[PDB]
PDB file of N, CA and C and ligand atoms in Angstrom:
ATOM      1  N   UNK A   1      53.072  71.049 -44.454  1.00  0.00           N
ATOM      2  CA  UNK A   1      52.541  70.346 -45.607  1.00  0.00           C
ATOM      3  C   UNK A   1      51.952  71.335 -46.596  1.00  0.00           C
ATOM      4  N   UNK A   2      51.303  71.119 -47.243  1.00  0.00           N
ATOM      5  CA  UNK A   2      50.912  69.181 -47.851  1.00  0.00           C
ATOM      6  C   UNK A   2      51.683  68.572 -48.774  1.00  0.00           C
ATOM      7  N   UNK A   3      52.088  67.391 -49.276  1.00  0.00           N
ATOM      8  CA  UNK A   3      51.625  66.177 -48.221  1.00  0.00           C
ATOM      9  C   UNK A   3      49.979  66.181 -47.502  1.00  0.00           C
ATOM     10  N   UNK A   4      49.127  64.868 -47.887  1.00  0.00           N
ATOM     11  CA  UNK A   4      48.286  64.918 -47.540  1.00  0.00           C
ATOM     12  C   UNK A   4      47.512  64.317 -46.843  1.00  0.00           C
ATOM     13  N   UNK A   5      48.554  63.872 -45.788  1.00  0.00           N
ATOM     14  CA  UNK A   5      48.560  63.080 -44.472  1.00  0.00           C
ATOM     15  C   UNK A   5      48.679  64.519 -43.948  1.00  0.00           C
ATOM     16  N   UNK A   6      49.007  65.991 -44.049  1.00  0.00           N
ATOM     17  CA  UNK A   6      49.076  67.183 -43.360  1.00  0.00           C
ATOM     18  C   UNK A   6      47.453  67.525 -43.312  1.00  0.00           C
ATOM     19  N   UNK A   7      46.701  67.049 -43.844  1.00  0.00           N
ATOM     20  CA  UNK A   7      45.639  67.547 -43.629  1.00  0.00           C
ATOM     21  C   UNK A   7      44.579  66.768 -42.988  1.00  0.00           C
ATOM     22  N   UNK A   8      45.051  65.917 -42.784  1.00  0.00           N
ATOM     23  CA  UNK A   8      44.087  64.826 -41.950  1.00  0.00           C
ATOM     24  C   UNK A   8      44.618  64.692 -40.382  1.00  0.00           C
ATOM     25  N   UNK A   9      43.375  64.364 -39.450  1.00  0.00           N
ATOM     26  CA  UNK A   9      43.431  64.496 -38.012  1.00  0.00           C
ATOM     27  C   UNK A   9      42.907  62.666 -37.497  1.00  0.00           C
ATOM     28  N   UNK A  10      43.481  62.381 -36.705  1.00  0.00           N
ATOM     29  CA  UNK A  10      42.490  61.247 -36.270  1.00  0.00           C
ATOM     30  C   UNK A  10      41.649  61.552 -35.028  1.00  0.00           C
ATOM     31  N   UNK A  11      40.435  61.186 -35.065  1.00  0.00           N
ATOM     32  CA  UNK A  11      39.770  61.275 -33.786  1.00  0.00           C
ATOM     33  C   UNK A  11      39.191  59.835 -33.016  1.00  0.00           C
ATOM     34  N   UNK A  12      39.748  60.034 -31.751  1.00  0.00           N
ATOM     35  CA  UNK A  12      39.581  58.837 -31.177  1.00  0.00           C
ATOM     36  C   UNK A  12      37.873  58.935 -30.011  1.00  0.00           C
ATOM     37  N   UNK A  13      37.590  57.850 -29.377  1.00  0.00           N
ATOM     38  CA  UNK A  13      36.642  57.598 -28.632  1.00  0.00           C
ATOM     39  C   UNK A  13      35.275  58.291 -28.996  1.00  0.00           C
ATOM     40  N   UNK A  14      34.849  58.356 -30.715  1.00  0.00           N
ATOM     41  CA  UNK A  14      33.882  59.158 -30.775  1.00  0.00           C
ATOM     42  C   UNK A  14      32.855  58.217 -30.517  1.00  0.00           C
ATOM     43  N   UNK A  15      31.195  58.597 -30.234  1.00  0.00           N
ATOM     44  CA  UNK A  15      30.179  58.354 -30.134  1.00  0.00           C
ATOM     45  C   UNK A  15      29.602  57.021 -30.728  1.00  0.00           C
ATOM     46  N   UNK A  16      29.847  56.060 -29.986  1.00  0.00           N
ATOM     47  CA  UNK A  16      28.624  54.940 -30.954  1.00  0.00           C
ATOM     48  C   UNK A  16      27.703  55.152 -31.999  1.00  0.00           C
ATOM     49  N   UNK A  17      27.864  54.925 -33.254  1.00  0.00           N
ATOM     50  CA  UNK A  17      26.678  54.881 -34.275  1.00  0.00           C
ATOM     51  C   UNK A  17      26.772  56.537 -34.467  1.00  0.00           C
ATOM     52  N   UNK A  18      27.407  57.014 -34.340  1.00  0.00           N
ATOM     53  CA  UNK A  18      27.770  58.908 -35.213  1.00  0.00           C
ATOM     54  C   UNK A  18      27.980  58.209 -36.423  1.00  0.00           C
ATOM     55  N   UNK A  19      26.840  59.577 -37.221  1.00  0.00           N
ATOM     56  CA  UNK A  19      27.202  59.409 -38.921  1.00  0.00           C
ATOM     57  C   UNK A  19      28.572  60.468 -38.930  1.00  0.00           C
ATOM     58  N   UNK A  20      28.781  60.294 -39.808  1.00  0.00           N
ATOM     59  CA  UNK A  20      30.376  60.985 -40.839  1.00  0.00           C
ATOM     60  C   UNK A  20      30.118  62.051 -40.517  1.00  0.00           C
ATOM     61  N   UNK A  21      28.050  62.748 -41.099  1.00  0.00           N
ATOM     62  CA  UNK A  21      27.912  64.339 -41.493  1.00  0.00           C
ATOM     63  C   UNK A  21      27.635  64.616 -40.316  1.00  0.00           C
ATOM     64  N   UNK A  22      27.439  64.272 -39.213  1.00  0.00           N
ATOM     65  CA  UNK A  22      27.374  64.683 -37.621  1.00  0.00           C
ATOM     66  C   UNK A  22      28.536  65.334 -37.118  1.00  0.00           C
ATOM     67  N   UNK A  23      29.181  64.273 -37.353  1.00  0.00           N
ATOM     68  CA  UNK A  23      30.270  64.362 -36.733  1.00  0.00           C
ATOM     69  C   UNK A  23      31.407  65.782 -37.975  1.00  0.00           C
ATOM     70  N   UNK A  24      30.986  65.724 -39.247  1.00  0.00           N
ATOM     71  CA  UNK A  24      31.553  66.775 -39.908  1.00  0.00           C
ATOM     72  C   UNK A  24      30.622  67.988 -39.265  1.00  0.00           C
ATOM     73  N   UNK A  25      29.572  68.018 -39.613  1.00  0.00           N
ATOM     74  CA  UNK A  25      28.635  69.113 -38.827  1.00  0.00           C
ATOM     75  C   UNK A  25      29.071  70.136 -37.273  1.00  0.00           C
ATOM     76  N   UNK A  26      29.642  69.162 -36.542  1.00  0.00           N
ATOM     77  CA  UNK A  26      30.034  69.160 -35.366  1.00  0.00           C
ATOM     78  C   UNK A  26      31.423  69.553 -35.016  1.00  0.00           C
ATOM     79  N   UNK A  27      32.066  69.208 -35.903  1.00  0.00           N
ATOM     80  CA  UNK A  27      33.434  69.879 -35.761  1.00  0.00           C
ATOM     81  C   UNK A  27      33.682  71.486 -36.538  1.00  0.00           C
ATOM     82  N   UNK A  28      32.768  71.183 -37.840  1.00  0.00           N
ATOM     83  CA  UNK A  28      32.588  72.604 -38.496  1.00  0.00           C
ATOM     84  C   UNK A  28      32.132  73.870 -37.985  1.00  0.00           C
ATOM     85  N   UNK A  29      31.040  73.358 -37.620  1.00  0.00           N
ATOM     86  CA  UNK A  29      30.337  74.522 -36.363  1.00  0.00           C
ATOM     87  C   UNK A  29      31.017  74.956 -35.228  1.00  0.00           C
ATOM     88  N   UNK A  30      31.353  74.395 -35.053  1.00  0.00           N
ATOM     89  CA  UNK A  30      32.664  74.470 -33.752  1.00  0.00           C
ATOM     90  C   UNK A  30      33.677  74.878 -33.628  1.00  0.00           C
ATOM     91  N   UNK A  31      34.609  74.757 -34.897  1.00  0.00           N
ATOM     92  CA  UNK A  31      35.955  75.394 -35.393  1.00  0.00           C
ATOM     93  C   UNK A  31      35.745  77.028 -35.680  1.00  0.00           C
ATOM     94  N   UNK A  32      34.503  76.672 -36.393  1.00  0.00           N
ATOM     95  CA  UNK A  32      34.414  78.378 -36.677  1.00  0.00           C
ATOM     96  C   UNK A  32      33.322  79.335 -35.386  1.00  0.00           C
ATOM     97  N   UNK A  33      33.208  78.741 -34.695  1.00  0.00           N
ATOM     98  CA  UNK A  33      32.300  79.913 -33.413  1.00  0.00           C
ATOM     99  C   UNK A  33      33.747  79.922 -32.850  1.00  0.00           C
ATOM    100  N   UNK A  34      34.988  78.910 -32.759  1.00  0.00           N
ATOM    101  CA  UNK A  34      36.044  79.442 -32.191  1.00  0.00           C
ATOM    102  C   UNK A  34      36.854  79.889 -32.648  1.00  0.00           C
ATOM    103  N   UNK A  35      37.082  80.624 -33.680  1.00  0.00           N
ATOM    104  CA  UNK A  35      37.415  81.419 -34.751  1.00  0.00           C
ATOM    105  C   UNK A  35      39.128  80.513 -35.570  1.00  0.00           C
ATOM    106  N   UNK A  36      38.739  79.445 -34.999  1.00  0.00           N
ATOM    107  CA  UNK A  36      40.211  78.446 -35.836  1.00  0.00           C
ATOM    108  C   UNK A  36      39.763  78.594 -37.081  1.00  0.00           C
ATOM    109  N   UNK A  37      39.207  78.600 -37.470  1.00  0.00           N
ATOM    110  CA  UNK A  37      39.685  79.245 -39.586  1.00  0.00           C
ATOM    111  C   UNK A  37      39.549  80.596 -39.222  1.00  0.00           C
ATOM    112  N   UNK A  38      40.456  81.077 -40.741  1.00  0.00           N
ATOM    113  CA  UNK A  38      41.022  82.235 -40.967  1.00  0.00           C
ATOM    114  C   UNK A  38      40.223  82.789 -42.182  1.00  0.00           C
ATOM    115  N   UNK A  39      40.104  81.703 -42.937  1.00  0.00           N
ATOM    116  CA  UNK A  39      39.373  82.013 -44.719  1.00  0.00           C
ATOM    117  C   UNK A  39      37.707  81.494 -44.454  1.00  0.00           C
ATOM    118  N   UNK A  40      37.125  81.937 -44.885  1.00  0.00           N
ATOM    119  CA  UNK A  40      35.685  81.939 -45.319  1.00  0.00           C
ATOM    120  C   UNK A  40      35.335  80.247 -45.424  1.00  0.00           C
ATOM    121  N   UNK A  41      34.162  80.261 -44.886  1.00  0.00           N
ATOM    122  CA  UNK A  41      33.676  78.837 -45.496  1.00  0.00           C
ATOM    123  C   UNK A  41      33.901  77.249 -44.188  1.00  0.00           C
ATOM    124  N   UNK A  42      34.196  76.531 -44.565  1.00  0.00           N
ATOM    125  CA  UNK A  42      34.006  75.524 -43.928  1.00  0.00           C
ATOM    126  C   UNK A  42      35.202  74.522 -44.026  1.00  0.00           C
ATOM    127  N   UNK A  43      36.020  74.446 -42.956  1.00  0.00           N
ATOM    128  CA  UNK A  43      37.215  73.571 -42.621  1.00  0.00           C
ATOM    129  C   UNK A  43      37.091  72.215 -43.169  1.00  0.00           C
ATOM    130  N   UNK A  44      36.633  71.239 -42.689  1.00  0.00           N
ATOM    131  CA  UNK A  44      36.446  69.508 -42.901  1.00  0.00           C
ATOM    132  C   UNK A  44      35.686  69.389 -43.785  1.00  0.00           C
ATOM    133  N   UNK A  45      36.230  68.757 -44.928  1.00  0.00           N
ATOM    134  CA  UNK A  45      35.747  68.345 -45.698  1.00  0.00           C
ATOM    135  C   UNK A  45      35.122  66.568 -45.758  1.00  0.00           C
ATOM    136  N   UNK A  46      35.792  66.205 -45.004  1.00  0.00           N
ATOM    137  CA  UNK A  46      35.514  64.548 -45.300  1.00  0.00           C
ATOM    138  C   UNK A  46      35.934  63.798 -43.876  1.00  0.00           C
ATOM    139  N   UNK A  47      34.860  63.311 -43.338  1.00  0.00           N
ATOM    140  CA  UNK A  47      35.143  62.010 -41.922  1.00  0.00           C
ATOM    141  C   UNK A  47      34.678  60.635 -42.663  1.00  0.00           C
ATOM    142  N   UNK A  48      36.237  60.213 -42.301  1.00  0.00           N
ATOM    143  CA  UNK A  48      35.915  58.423 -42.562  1.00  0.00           C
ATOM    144  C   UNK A  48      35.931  57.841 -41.328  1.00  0.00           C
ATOM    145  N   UNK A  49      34.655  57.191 -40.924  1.00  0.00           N
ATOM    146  CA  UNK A  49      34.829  56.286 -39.857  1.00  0.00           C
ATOM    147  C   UNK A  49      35.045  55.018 -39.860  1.00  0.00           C
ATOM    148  N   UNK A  50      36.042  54.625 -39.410  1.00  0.00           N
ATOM    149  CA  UNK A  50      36.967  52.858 -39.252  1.00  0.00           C
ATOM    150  C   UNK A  50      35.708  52.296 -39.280  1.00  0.00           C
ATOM    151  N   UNK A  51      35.888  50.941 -39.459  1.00  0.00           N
ATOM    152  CA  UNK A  51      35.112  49.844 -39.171  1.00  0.00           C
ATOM    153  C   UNK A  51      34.142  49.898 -37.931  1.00  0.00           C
ATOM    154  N   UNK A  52      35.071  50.150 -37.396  1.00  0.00           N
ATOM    155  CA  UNK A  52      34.328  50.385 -35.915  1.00  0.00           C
ATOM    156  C   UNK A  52      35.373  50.750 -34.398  1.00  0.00           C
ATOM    157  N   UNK A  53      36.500  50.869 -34.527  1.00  0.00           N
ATOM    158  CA  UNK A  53      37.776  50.855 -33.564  1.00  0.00           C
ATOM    159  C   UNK A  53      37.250  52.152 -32.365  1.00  0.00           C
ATOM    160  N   UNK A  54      35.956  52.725 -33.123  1.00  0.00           N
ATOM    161  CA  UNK A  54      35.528  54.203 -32.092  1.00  0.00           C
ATOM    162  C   UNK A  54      35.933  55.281 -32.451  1.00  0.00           C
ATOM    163  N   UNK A  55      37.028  55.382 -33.575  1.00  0.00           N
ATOM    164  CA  UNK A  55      37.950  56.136 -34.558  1.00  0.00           C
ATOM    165  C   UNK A  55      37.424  56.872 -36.080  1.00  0.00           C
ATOM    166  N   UNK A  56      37.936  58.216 -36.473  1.00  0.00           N
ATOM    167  CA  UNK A  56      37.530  58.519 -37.125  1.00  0.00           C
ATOM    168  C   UNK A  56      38.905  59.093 -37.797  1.00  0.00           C
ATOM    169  N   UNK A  57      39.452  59.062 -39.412  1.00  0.00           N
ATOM    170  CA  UNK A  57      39.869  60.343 -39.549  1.00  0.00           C
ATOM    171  C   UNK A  57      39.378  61.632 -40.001  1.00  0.00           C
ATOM    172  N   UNK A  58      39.657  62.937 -40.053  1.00  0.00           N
ATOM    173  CA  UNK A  58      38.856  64.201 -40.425  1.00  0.00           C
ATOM    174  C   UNK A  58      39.947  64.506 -41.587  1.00  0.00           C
ATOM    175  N   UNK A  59      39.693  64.953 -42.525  1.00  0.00           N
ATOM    176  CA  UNK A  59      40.123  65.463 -44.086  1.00  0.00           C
ATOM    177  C   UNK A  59      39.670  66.918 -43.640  1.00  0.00           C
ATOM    178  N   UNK A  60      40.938  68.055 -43.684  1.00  0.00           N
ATOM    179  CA  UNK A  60      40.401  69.310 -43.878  1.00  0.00           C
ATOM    180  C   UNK A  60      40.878  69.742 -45.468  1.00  0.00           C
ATOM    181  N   UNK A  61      40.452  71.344 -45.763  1.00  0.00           N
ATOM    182  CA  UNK A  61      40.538  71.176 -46.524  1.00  0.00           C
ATOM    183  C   UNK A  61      42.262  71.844 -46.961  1.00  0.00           C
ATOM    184  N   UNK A  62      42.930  72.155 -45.516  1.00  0.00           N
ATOM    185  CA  UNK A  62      43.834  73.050 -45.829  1.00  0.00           C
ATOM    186  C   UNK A  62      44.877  72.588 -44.372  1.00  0.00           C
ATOM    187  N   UNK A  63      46.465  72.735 -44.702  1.00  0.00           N
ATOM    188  CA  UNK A  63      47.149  72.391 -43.584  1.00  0.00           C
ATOM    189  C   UNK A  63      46.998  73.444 -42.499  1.00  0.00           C
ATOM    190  N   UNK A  64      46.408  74.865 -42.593  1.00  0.00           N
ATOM    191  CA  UNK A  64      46.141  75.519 -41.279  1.00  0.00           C
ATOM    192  C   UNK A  64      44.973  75.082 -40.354  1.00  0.00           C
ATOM    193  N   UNK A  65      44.022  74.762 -41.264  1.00  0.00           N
ATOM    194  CA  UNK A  65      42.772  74.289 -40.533  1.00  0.00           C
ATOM    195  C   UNK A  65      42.992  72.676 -39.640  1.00  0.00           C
ATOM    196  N   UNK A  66      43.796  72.450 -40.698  1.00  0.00           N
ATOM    197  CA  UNK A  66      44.451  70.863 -39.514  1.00  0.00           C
ATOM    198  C   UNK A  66      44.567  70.798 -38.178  1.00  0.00           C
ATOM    199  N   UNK A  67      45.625  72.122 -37.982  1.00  0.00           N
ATOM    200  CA  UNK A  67      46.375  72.487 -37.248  1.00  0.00           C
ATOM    201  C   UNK A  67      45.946  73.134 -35.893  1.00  0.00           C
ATOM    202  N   UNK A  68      44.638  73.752 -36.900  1.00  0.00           N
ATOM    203  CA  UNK A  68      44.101  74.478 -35.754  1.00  0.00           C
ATOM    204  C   UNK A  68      43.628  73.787 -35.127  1.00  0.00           C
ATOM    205  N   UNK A  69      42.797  72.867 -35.557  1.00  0.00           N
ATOM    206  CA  UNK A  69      41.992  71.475 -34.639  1.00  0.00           C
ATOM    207  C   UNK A  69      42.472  70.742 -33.886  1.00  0.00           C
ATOM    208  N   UNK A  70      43.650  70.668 -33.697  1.00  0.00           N
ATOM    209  CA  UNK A  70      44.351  70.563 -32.709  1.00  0.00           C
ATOM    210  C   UNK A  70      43.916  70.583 -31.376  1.00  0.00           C
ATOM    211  N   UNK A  71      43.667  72.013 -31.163  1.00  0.00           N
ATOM    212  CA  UNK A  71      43.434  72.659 -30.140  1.00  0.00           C
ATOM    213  C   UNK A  71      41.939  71.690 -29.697  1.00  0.00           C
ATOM    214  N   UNK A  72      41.416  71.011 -30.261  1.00  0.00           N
ATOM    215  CA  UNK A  72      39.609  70.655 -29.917  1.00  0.00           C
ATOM    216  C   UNK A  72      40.232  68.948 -29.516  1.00  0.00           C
ATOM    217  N   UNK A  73      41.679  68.706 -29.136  1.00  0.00           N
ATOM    218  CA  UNK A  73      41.376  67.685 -28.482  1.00  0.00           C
ATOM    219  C   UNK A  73      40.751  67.396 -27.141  1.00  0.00           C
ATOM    220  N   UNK A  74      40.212  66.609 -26.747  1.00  0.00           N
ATOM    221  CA  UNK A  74      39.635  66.326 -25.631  1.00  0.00           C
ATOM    222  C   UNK A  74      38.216  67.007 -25.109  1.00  0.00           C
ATOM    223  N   UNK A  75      37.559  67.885 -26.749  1.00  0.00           N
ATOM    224  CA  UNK A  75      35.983  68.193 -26.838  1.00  0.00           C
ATOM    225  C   UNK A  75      35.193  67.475 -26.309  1.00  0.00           C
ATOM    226  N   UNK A  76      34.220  68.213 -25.798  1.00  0.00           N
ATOM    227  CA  UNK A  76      33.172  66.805 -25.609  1.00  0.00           C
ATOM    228  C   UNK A  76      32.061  66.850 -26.985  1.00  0.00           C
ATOM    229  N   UNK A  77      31.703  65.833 -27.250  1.00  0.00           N
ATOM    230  CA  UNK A  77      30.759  65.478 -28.282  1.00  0.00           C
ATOM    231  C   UNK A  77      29.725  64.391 -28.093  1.00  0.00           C
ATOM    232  N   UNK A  78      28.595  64.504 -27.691  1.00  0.00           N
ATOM    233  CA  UNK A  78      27.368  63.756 -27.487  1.00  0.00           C
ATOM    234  C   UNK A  78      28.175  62.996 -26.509  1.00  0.00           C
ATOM    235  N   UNK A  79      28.502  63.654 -25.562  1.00  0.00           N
ATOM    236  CA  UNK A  79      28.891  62.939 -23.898  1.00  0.00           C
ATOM    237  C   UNK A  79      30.165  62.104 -24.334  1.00  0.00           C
ATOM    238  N   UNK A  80      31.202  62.118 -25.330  1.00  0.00           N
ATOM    239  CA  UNK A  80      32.548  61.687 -25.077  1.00  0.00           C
ATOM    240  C   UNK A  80      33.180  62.840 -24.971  1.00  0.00           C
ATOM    241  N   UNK A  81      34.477  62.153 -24.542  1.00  0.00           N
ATOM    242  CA  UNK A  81      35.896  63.626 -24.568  1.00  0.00           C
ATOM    243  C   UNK A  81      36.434  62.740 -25.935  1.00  0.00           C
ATOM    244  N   UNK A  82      36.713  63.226 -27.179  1.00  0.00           N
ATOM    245  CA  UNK A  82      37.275  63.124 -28.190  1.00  0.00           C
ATOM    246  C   UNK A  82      38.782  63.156 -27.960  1.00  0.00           C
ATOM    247  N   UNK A  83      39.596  62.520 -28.142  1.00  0.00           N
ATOM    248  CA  UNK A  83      41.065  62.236 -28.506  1.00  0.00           C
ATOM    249  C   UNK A  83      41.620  62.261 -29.997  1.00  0.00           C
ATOM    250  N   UNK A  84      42.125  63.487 -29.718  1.00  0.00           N
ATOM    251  CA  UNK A  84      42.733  63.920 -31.242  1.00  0.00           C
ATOM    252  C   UNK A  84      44.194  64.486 -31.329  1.00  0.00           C
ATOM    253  N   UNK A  85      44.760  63.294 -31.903  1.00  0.00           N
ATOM    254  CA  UNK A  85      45.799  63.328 -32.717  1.00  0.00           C
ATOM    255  C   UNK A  85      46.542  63.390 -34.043  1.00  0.00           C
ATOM    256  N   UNK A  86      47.701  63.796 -34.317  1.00  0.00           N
ATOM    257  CA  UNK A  86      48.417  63.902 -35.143  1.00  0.00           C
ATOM    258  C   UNK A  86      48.057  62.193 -36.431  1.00  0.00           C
ATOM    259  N   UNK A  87      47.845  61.629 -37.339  1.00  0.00           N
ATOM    260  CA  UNK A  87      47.800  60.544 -37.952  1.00  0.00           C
ATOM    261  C   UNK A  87      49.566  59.781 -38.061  1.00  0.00           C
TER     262      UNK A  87
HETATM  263 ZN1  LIG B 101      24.821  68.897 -42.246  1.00  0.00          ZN
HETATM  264 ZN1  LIG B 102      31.925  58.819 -46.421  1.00  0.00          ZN
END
């Protein structure tokens, strides 16, 4: 991509009542202590959380950083294993 369905991730089984910036906070910090970005700065730009399905999607800001996140399926985050897939 992009195409900008290439830059978005879905994340499944997250945390009851997680805000957006937690959960952006949390993946940001995380991507980069594991060195998945390459460029300076900060991957995810934007988590929309569904209604409520337990689902989130993540907006990065670039199709490598997508890609890399990948790799953080099945993280744990405030005691879930996160399920992350392709959208
Ligand atoms: Zn913050
Ligand atoms: Zn929002």
């Amino acid at each position: 991509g992009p195409l900008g369905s290439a830059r978005r991730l879905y994340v499944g089984n997250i945390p009851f009542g997680i805000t957006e910036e937690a959960m952006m906070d949390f993946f940001n910090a995380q991507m980069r202590l594991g060195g998945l970005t390459q460029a300076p700065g900060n991957p995810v730009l934007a988590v929309q959380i569904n209604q409520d399905k337990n689902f989130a999607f993540l907006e990065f800001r670039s199709v490598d950083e997508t890609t890399q996140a990948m790799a953080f399926d099945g993280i744990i985050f405030q005691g879930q294993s996160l399920k992350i897939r392709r959208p």
